[PDB]
Curated annotation (Swiss-Prot), chains A, B, C:
Cellular compartment(s): Encapsulin nanocompartment
One Pfam family named in its UniProt record: Linocin_M18
Stated role: Shell component of a type 1 encapsulin nanocompartment. Assembles into proteinaceous shells 23-24 nm in diameter with 2-2.5 nm thick walls. Endogenous cargo protein DyP (dye-decolorizing peroxidase) is targeted to the interior via its C-terminal extension; only 1 DyP hexamer is incorporated into each shell. Empty shells can be isolated in the absence of cargo. Cargo encapsulation probably precedes assembly of the nanocompartment; may assemble or disassemble via dimers, subcomplexes with a distinct preference for even numbers of subunits are detected.
Name of the protein this chain belongs to: Type 1 encapsulin shell protein
Subunit structure comment from the entry: Homomultimeric. This encapsulin nanocompartment is formed by 60 subunits, and encloses one Dyp homohexamer; partially assembled 58-subunit compartments with and without cargo are also purified. May assemble the shell from dimers. Monomers form pentamers, which assemble to form hollow shells with pores 5-8 Angstroms in diameter where 3 pentamers meet.
Gene coding for it: enc
Keywords annotated in UniProt: Encapsulin nanocompartment
Length: 266, 266, 266
């Protein structure tokens, strides 16, 4: 057994497969930061830090002795617990195809939104710097009319061309802004296709953890997600009616390049 | 070239070998912590932290989300710069065997004493916990008479037997206490041989960075020195008369077991 | 060692690779003349001239003796010096991925803009004739409305068809004009795509060293860039805090055909 105590859960193999499939499917559709960030692959639960390669002066009074200390970013562990009824678990073996996995879907939505909220807006209680507050480019204001949003995106593209950052540009929209863009037309054809012709092999991302919008280069050396443990399901507890489980991820995140993104502020 | 800019120093190969030999020889005789601590070998300049395997609660307000952060110890870099005259360097090629390497000897003494001072007494400006302030055993008082020091060492051995720690025991003495023990007899034979019969395949260490004395088990799982870069000579600067160099080490240190050492207080 | 004194710079290999990558990446995105001009490849630092194949009468008073002198264009050397802090250089070996290379980016922008300014507008202090002042076609005036710029480009295309120059036509825009064209629509679709349908396998170039715009044939025998030394990084000087470096290029440039370009004047 490992720290996920999976062999102690009263859950047969095919019920495990269904819980896993709902977790993976819901998590993947709600993660947006992984599509724009270099993802150093999962290196295990035991890894704890990624260095920034910077040092810091340490106070010393010994004559002729200089002390530095390295600076790292310690990995955060995210955990979302969820409770599953044992009747759905047991009904999998009777041939049910409609067992209630809505708690695992809610947990996968919560952990995906927490991961994108750490990557995009930072987590200051742990010293994670997000892409949006670390951007050195000023925020281009989102207009209240959706017919001017393509002009705001072209202004952000001219900002990124002006500061010397060229690559494929992805545009991450918040759920409200993605909704406004998906439910609007300008000359008979939708505003999402007004946006997708400006990008040119960059994509338009629904980012439900974002607030406004974010234009970002997928140049490929600017943001680093250091995944320790990828999305894993663990066991916590059970009684006669329910099994208590959790989802878990460990990672560090480093936003190296400040200039390669333009926030679109609400 | 690497971060030690050795190929830019105006120092021929055989002068480099003499500086290296004086540095290694002086450093090894003055290090005492490496003889009692498990030394995980040099893993390079790039390593920056060793995990403690402990986590810490991070403040979060998202419903159903728990955030932890790993806890590591960031490596410290020690640097001792020293200046060598170019006349000694150049005289090596004329066949001199008495070139002045006293600055490198002073630098090696300083960096060895800084390393043992970090291991034994801690470095609180960097969060290194030393063996002596981390000891859970109370301090056995060193008597002012050197004829009672063997009784203090036997009392410390009974402390270590009482708390259930048995292995070969090493006894690290400060330079003043090592001097008092080496310059004293009790029944015609020296007090260092009164001490060495109590230890029984443990050794008596001269530890010039210590203040009083320290009895410690070499059981072999209690203290971990995580060497990043071992003792290296780097180049800094030169003028027509002198070359400015430095010695460098990077390491983390973890004192796992609090109970396996008894301080002997002055 | 060669005239770039690279082996004397206190810069390790991987820091050199990062400086090189930033220099190449910034230089390539800011050069526009190399995309329209035949580039005779780099022949080395030692080459000094390219002939124009024309001669000139020399004054002689000897009876029955005619003296001519060949006419060449001497290569120019461009040098942009930049200073890099040694802390960024040294942090590369500690695993930093955010070392400050903004000085090399500013230097690469400056040397790319100087090269395009020599190719496009000439360098009269060295006798380089640019494409724009050497054009025998009159300037088609850029309208102040961006909705008429496609009509100005069609007028310039009819000029080039009228003087008998047909090939793929590229359109080089200044940064202001490229910005106005990228941030504008005419019937729901951008003005850059109004321009790109007139060209027909010719491209639309952002040329930040240009003033107005320039339509030009890539017929393929009209303009010759004779590269002596391609973009190279050299070492100049260093102190304890910074290394002084430079970027360098050597080239001659010949604009053979006057008729194959139409300037679009501001």
């Amino acid at each position: 057994v490992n720290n996920l105590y999976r062999e102690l859960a009263p859950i047969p193999g095919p019920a495990w497969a269904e819980i896993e499939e709902e977790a993976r499917r819901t998590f993947k559709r709600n993660i947006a930061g992984r599509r724009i960030v270099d993802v150093a692959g999962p290196t295990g639960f035991e890894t704890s830090a990624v260095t920034t390669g910077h040092i810091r002066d340490v106070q010393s009074e010994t004559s002729g002795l200089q002390v530095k200390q390295r600076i790292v970013q310690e990995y955060i562990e995210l955990r979302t617990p969820f409770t599953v009824t044992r009747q759905a678990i047991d009904d999998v073996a009777r041939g049910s195809g409609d067992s209630d996995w809505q708690p695992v879907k809610d947990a996968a939505t919560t952990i995906a939104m927490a991961e994108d909220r750490a990557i995009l807006h930072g987590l200051d209680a742990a010293g994670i710097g997000g892409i949006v507050p670390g951007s050195s480019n000023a925020a281009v204001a989102i207009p209240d009319a959706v017919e001017d949003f393509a002009d705001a995106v072209a202004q952000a593209l001219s900002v990124l061309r002006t500061v010397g950052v060229d690559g494929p540009y992805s545009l991450l929209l918040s759920s409200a802004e993605y909704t406004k863009v998906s439910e609007s037309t300008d000359h008979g054809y939708p505003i999402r296709e007004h946006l997708s012709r400006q990008l040119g092999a960059g994509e338009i991302i629904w980012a439900p953890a974002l607030e406004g919008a974010l234009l970002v280069s997928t140049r490929g050396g600017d943001y680093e997600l250091h995944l320790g443990q990828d999305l894993s399901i663990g066991y916590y507890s059970h009684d006669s009616e329910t099994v208590e489980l959790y989802l878990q991820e460990t990672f560090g995140f480093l936003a190296l390049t400040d200039e390669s993104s333009v926030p679109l502020s609400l």
